[PDB]
Amino acid sequence: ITGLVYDQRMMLHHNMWDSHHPELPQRISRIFSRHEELRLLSRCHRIPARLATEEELALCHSSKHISIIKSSEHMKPRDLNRLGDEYNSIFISNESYTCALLAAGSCFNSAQAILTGQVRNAVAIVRPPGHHAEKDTACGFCFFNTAALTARYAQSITRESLRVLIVDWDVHHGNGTQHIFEEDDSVLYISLHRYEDGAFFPNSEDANYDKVGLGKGRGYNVNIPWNGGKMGDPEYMAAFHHLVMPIAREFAPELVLVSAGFDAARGDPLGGFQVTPEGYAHLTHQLMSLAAGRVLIILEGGYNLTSISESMSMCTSMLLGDSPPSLPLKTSATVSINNVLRAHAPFWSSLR
Numbered sequence: 090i091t092g093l094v095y096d097q098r099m100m101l102h103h104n105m106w107d108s109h110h111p112e113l114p115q116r117i118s119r120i121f122s123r124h125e126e127l128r129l130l131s132r133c134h135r136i137p138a139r140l141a142t143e144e145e146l147a148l149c150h151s152s153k154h155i156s157i158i159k160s161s162e163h164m165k166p167r168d169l170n171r172l173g174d175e176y177n178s179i180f181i182s183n184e185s186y187t188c189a190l191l192a193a194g195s196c197f198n199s200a201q202a203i204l205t206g207q208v209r210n211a212v213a214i215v216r217p218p219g220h221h222a223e224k225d226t227a228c229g230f231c232f233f234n235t236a237a238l239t240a241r242y243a244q245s246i247t248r249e250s251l252r253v254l255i256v257d258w259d260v261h262h263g264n265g266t267q268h269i270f271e272e273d274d275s276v277l278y279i280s281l282h283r284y285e286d287g288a289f290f291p292n293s294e295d296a297n298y299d300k301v302g303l304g305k306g307r308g309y310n311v312n313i314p315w316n317g318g319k320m321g322d323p324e325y326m327a328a329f330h331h332l333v334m335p336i337a338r339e340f341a342p343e344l345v346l347v348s349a350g351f352d353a354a355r356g357d358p359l360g361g362f363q364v365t366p367e368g369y370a371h372l373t374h375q376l377m378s379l380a381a382g383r384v385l386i387i388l389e390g391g392y393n394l395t396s397i398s399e400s401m402s403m404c405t406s407m408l409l410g411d412s413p414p415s416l417p418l419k420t421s422a423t424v425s426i427n428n429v430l431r432a433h434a435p436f437w438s439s440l441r
């Protein structure tokens with residue numbers, strides 16, 4: 090059984106000053122409609138959305154940050170503009186707080202349905218995204234860190250030691266997810282992301298391959314940064330073969346969370362990459378070999394409405410058990426992979 094959560098209330102979050110901003114309400118409705126058209130919806134068990142509580146938000150976020158975002162619910166437009174401009178790449182409407190609560194709460198219910206045997210795996214069609222959100226601040230279209238919160242929530246309804254792997258294949262680095270778990274060996278963060286020597290958003294050297302974690306988390310932060318090249322299926326397949334899957338298998342996760350942005354997809358106006366829907370199907374199919382198959386796929390970014398609808402639907406098709414479809418690397422991609430091997434071989438015996 091595959092679970093699926095989609096609540097149309099999360100369409101309410103919008104940018105009232107620029108209706109052409111790519112983080113569109115139709116991101117989630119188009120993905121959902123495509124699941125109907127492909128007859129995938131009726132094959133899933135529908136999981137209800139719910140509001141995360143303020144104490145659940147405190148699993149990862151400060152009281153001050155929670156209160157500031159909560160205060161926007163009744164703000165006038167002039168004050169929503171002011172508040173949003175205080176952050177890196179954030180717009181806020183009165184409904185933004187509700188939608189962010191629903192996105193986190195939807196994934197909590199999905200993680201719970203998985204960890205209580207209700208379903209094997211699940212897909213969460215949620216917005217706004219989360220992986221750029223930090224403990225104390227919003228950033229890059231993200232208010233609360235849905236994937237990070239879900240990992241801590243999953244630990245809270247089972248055991249703190251629950252080994253959670255977060256694979257972040259959104260084309261952007263998940264700076265918030267990295268920082269939240271930077272000193273933690275219970276949550277393994279693996280990010281693949283376009284980097285371009287810091288020129289790609291979020292524009293921080295924190296995203297480079299040499300940032301491996303701190304303290305007891307040393308070795309449990311895996312950055313796979315791309316430079317100088319339009320990466321696609323061969324590069325992501327290779328990164329999975331040489332890095333993601335050997336490290337994950339050695340880590341032996343008990344729950345896989347995919348920060349599943351689809352902005353590395355062919356056609357995305359912000360990513361510039363060319364991962365195909367079949368490529369995303371193969372990455373999902375490989376992740377399902379972990380954690381007895383319990384994978385929760387959480388929508389992050391992705392801004393080509395057609396590309397994200399095809400791509401995420403393909404992932405659900407894989408989770409439903411459908412057969413994986415039929416499928417030289419860019420030179421810098423080998424350099425990137427060899428960089429991560431150099432940084433991480435002292436921590437993972439599977440890399441030698």
Ligand SMILES: CN(Cc1ccc(C(=O)NO)cc1F)C[C@]12C[C@H]3C[C@H](C[C@H](C3)C1)C2
Pocket residue numbers: 110111177178218221228229230259260261290350352359389390391
């Ligand atoms: C870098 N951009 C922001 C951005 C992009 C992607 C993601 C993501 O998908 N993370 O996972 C998060 C982000 F903060 C800026 C810009 C400036 C302008 C108006 C908007 C549309 C376009 C022209 C790019 C925002």
Ligand code: PRO
Pocket residue numbers: 140162186187190
């Ligand atoms: O009142 C409402 O509708 C929203 C729901 C979350 C908090 N406020």
Ligand SMILES: [K+]
Pocket residue numbers: 257258259260261262263280281282
């Ligand atoms: K990423």
Ligand SMILES: [K+]
Pocket residue numbers: 270271272273274276277278302306309310
């Ligand atoms: K970590």
Ligand SMILES: [Zn+2]
Pocket residue numbers: 259260261350352389390391
């Ligand atoms: Zn992104």
